[model samples]
Target: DGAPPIMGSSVYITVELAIAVLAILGNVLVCWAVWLNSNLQNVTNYFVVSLAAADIAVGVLAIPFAITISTGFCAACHGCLFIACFVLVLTQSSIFSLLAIAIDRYIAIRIPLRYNGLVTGTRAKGIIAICWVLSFAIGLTPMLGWNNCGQPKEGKNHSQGCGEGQVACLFEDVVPMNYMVYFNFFACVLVPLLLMLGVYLRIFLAARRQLADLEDNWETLNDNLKVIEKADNAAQVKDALTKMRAAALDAQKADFRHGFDILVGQIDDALKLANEGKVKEAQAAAEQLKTTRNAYIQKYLERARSTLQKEVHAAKSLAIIVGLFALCWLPLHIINCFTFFCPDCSHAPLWLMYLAIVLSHTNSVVNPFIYAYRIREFRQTFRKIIRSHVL
Candidate 1:
C-alpha cells in the first residue's frame, strides 16, 4: 500500500524534522544579523550573507521535500527532479562560498597591505555572484539531461540504483557526478585549506619574530637607562624626574607588552625554535619584529585618528572566512568521509550527520556574531543599529 513503509522510526523522523526547522531558523537569523547591521556590511559579511541565503534555500527547497518523500508522499518524477537539481545547486553554491571565504583570508593575511585594494566590496559581491552562477550551471547540467537520471535495470540494481526517479532522475551519467564531486573537493576544499594553512603559518612566524625582538630591545634599553637611577637632585626635581622615569618605563613596558602578547600563547613551534639556540632563527625573528613594530605603530596612530576602519574591515573578513570554514565545509568533510567509507550506513540512523549539516548551515549566521565579538568598531556600530531599531 505504501512505498517501503516510509523507512524510519518515529524518533528518527522527529529529529530529522527538528534539524530541518533549526537549520531554517538559524540561517535566517544569520542573514538578518548581518544585513541589519552596517558594521557587518564588509566583504566577509557579504560572502557570509550569500552562504546564509544558500543555506535557507536548502532548508526551504530541499529538506522539506526530502522529508515529504521520505514520508511516502509519492511526488511526481519531474517535480522531484527539479527539487533535486535546485538542492544540488544551492549546496554547491554554499560550498563555493566557503571556498571564497578561505581564499579571501589567504589573500588578506598573505598580502596585508594590498588586501583592501584586491577584495573591495564590489569585487567581493561579484565573486559571490559568480559562485552562485557556477553552482546553478553545475546543478542544471543534470536536469538538462547531460547526466543519467532514470530507473535502474533489474539485473544492474546493486551496481546502479538510487531508487527509481528520486536519486537517478537528476542525472543521465554518473561520470559527471563523480567528476563534479572530485573537482569540488579539489577546488573548493583541498586548495583553500592549503592556502589558509600557509597564510596562518606565515602570520604566526612573523608575529613570533616581532615579539622576540621587542623583548631584546626592552632589555637593552633598561640596561642603558639604569645609570639615571643614581643621579642626585633637589626634592621637587627628584619627584618630577621620578615621575618622568616611571612614565618612560611604563611606555616601554606597554610597547613590549603589546608586541609580546600578540604572539603569546599562539606559538608552540616558535618557542621551540627560540629555545633551541638557533641564531639564524633569532635573526629571522628580529626581521619580523622590525616589520611588525612599524606596522603596529602605524595602525595605532591611525586608530587615534579614526582612520583604521580599513584594518578592522580586513580582520572582519578573515574572521568571517574562518567562521564559515568551521561551520560549513567541516561538516561536509565529515559527511564525505563517512559516506565514502560506509556507503550502506542508513542516512536516517546517522543523526549526527544531520546535526552536522544543520550546524554547518549556521556558518553564515555566525559571521556577524564573530565580527561583533572581535572587532570593536563593528561592535559599536552594531550596538548603535540595534539601539536605533529598538528605539
Candidate 2:
C-alpha cells in the first residue's frame, strides 16, 4: 500500500541492462584508447577520460541497484539508501566532469598560449579528484541525517521502515524532497548547467573572433600583395603598401603580439624609401617584404590555422556533449520538480518517470559515439581497438 512497483518493470529492466552493457563497452573503449595512444593524451582528453570513468561506474554499480529500487525489490532501507546514494554520486560526477570540461575549454580558448602551462597534467588530475570528492559529499548528503529515516514527524506521506515492517525502498520514500529540490536540483544541477552554458558561449565567441581575425589578416596580406605587384599607379601602390603596414601592426597588437618576424620592419623600410621618392628601391624592398610574408604564411600561419581549427573542432564536440547532457538530464529534473512542488499530484505518471530515467541513462550510451564521430583520433583509436579485439 506504500509505493507500488514500477509498471512493466520487466521491459524497463531489460532496456536499462542493455544500456548498461553499451555504456560499459563504449566507455571502456574510450579509456583504453586514451591509455594506449599518446596522441590523445592532453588535459582536455584527460577530463573526457574522467567522464568515461563515471559512465563506466553507472554501468557497473548504479543500474542494477536502480532496477531493484524501482521495482520494489530492495527490501532494506539501508540497502536502498546505499544504492540511491551511489546513483546520486554518479549523477553528480557526470555533471561535475562536464563542468570541468567546459572550464578547461573556456580557459584554453580565452588563453590559448598559456593553457598548457596553466592546466598541467598534475593540476588536471588534482581537479578531477576534487570533482569526484565534491560529488561524493553532495550525493551522500542524505546519507548523513537528511534522509527520511527516523523522521517520523514527516513520515505521514512517505514510508520509512525505521520502526516498521518491510517497507519497499522507493527512491522518494528515502530521499527527502527538500534535498532533491533545493540542494541537489537548484544548487548543484541548475547552477552547474547554467554555468557551463555561459562558459561555452564565451568560449565560442572568443574562438570565433580569434579565427575571424586571423583569416582577415591572411586575406588582407594576399590582397595587398596582389595590389602592390599589379597596380601600375604609384599612388595605388603607395596606398596598398600603407595597408600592408597597418595589417602588420594589427597582427602585432593581437594573438601574434610577438611580431611577425621582421614583416613589419620590412614594410616600414619600403614605406620610407617610397616616401623619399626612390621608386625603384621602394619597389625592390616591397618585393622582398612580399617574399618574406609569403614564406611566413607558408611556414607558420598554416600550422597555426590548422592548430586553431583542431582546437575549435574539439571545443565544438565538447559543447555538443554538454548540450546532450542538458537534454538528457533536464527532463528528469523537471519531473522531479513536478512531483515535489505540485501539492495536488501524488507522483508523476509511471511511464513519464520511466521515460525520464531511461533518457538520463542513455546519455552514457550516446557519449562514446559522439567522441568517435566528432574527433578523428577517437575514431581511429576506436577502430584500432575493435580491429585488435574483434578481427
Candidate 3:
C-alpha cells in the first residue's frame, strides 16, 4: 500500500512552505547586509554570515527534500539516501557554525585586547572552511556504508527483507536509527551544545567578576572619614571633611542619587560644625556619619546590583534561546532513540512523527529572528537594504 494521507499533512505542508520562504528571505538579508556593509565585516560578523548561509541552504535545499520525503515521492533508494544525507550535512554545518560563533565570543571575552590579533579574518575563514569540511565528513557517514543498506538486524532466520535496494523510502527505513541516536545525537550534536553552554557561562562569570573589581573604591573615602572622626582641631576636621566630600563626588557622578544626597548633607553639616569652631561636635558628627555611610553604601550596592542584572539580560536571553533550540530539536532524536531501542514495542503514530519533523524544521525558521534580528547593526542594515533595494 502507498503512503496513507495524514489528516494535517496539508496544514503542515503550507506551514513548511511559509517557513522556507521566510528563512530564505531573512537569511538572504543577513548575508546581503553583511556583504554590502564594510562596518559589518568583522570576524564575529563573518561567523553570523556563515550561519545565515547555512540557514539559506536549509530553506532552499532541505525543506524541499523534506517535503518530497513526506509525500513519499521516490526516484530510487540511493536518491532518497542522498537527500537524507544532504540534510544531515546541512544540519551539522549549522551546528558547527554556531559552535564557531560561541568559540569566537569566548575568546573575545576571555582576552579582549588580543582577540583581533588572534582571530583574524583569514583565520576565521579557514576555520569556517574546516567546519563545513568536518560537517560533510561527519554527516555523510551513513552514505559511507553505515546506512540501512543490508538486511534488517532482527530475525536471523526469517528472510522477509529489503530486497535489492527496493525498500520503502521512509526515513527510518533507509537512514539507520543507530546513526541518528548514537553517532549523530550523542557523539556530534550534544557535545558541541554543552561546550557552547559552558563557554557562555564562563564569559558571563568573568564579566561579572571584572565589573565587581572595578565598580567602587570607597576604602579611600573610609580613611578620610576616620581622619575627620579622630581630629583634635577644627582646622584638621575641616580639611578631612573637604577630602571626604571630594571623594563623595565620584559616587555622585556614578549615580548614587538618594544615598549620596543624605551623605553629602551629613558631610556639609559636619563641615559647618568645624567652621563654627565646635571641634568636638564636628568629631562627634563624623562618628555618626560613619554609620550613615555604612547604611548608604549598602543601599547603593543594592541599586548597583539591579543595573548589573539589566546589563546581563543578553546572557539570560541567550540561555533561553539555547533552551528553546533544545526544546525544538530533542523530540525527533528522542523518537529516533526510542525506535532504535524498542523496535518491537508499540510504534509512534504517524502524526506524532510528522509533528516532530515539523518542530525540528521550525528551528531553522526561528534562527534568523533569534540570532540575526537581535543585533542592532544587522537590524539597521536590514532596514537600509529594504528601503533602498526592496521597497
Candidate 4:
C-alpha cells in the first residue's frame, strides 16, 4: 500500500492559541506596568523584569510552535531549533532570575542590619551582570554547536532543510543522553532547583528569626510600649515618641530606600511619557500620564495610601512572587528531564506531553495574575487600569 498526506488547521488549536495570547498579553502588560516605574536594567529589579521577558518569549515561541507542528502548518528544521533554543534561553533566564531573587530575599531577611551594604544598587548590578553572562554562556551552547541540535519530539521529519552555511549544528539528531543528563539535568535544573529550595527555606526561617528578634525573643514589645506611654513630661514624651519613630524607620531604611526607588522610577516613567507625548504631539497620553502621576505623587499626603512606611508588605509581596516562580518553573524542568530520558517520549500520547507543555507555559500567563492578586501596589494599580479603561 502507498500513502500520501494532507495537512491543515483546526479549531482544536484554540487551546494553545488562547494560552499563547494570554502569555503574550499577560507578561507584556505586567512588564509594561512594572517597567514604567523601574528601569528594567536596574540592579535590584533585574530578575523580575528579565524573568517576565524570558517567560513570555518562551510561550510566544513554544505554544504556537507546538500547535503548528501538530497541524503541520510548520514543522521545519529551523522551527525545531527555534523551539529548543527558546527552551534553553527561557530556562536559563528563569533559573538565574529565581536564584537572584532568593539571594536578594536572603539579604533582606537574614542580614537586615547589614542589607544596605550587602545589596546596594551598584553591587547588585554587578551580580545581575554575572548572572546574565552565566545564563547565556550555557544557553548559547546549542546554537554554537557545543551540544547536539535536533528535531523536537513533535516536529520530527523536518525536511525544511538546513542551510549550507559553515554552521556546525545544521544536521539533525536526538540530543545526546549524556548532554541531557549532565547539562540540562545536573548543571542547569538540579543546581538551580536545589539552591532555590535551600535559599527559600533559609529565607523563611530567617524571616521568622527576624520577627523573633524584633519581638525581643518572641515576647510582646509591650514593655517598650508601656515605657513610651508612661512618659510624664509632655515635651519629654513627644521627644521620646519622635525618637522611637525615627529608630523604627531607620531600622527599615533599606526597605524604604528600595521602595522609594521603585516609586521614583515609575514616577520618572510618567515624566518620560509626558515628555514623549509633548514631543510627539500626543496630548492624550500626556494627560493620562499626569493623572496617574497625580495619584502616586499625592501618596505622602494620604498616609493610608502609601506603603512606604512599612517594609513587611513589600517583603511578603516579593517573597510570594519568588515563591510562585519556583512552584511554576519547577515542573517545566522536571518534565524536560523526564522527556529527555524517556525513549518513547516522541511516541507518547499527545495529551500527556501536551498537558505537561501547556501547564508549564501557563506559568508565564499566571504570573501577572499572581502579581496583581498578591502585591497590593500592583493589585491597586491593576484595578486602576481596569476601572480607567477596560470597563
Q: For each candidate, what TM-score against the reference?
A: 0.56, 0.86, 0.73, 0.61
- lDDT by residue (247-266, candidate 4, tens digit) is 33333332235443443343
- Which numbered prediction scores highest in lDDT against the true structure? 2
User: In candidate 1, how many Å is residue 332 off?
Assistant: 6.0
Tell me the lDDT of model 4 at 335: 58
What is the C-alpha local distance difference test score of each model?
A: 0.53, 0.80, 0.75, 0.55
How much is the lDDT of residue 285 in candidate 4?
A: 24
Q: How well is each residue in 1-391 modelled by candidate 1, as lDDT tens digits?
A: 7544335336555655665666676666566667766766778667767877876765566666555534333334455556545656776676677667656665664565688988898888788888899888766555565444354333433344445443332222222434344554555556656666565555545434444544444443233223223333233223433343343333343244564344322122233443465434533433343344355533443342342234345544564555466556566555565555566885433456446645654453454556566767666765665677664
Clashes of each: 10, 0, 0, 2
Candidate order (lDDT)? 2, 3, 4, 1
Using TM-score as the yardstick, the better of models 1 and 3 is 3
* Best TM-score among the predictions, by candidate number: 2
Q: Give per-residue CA lDDT, model 2, range 1-391, as digits (tens).
A: 7554444777799899998999999999999999999999988889889889989998987888778777554255555678787977888988888888889888887887787889888988998899899999999988788877664333432343333433566778788888888999999989999999899888878867877887787778768877777766556667888987777666543334323757878878777877776666776778876577666654566776687777778888988988888889889888888888898987888888888888888888888999899988999999998999886
How far does residue 203 in candidate 4 sit from its true spot (Å)?
1.9
Between candidates 1 and 2, name the one with more favorable lDDT.
2
For candidate 2, the per-residue lDDT at 63 reads 84
* Residue 59 displacement (Å), model 2: 0.7
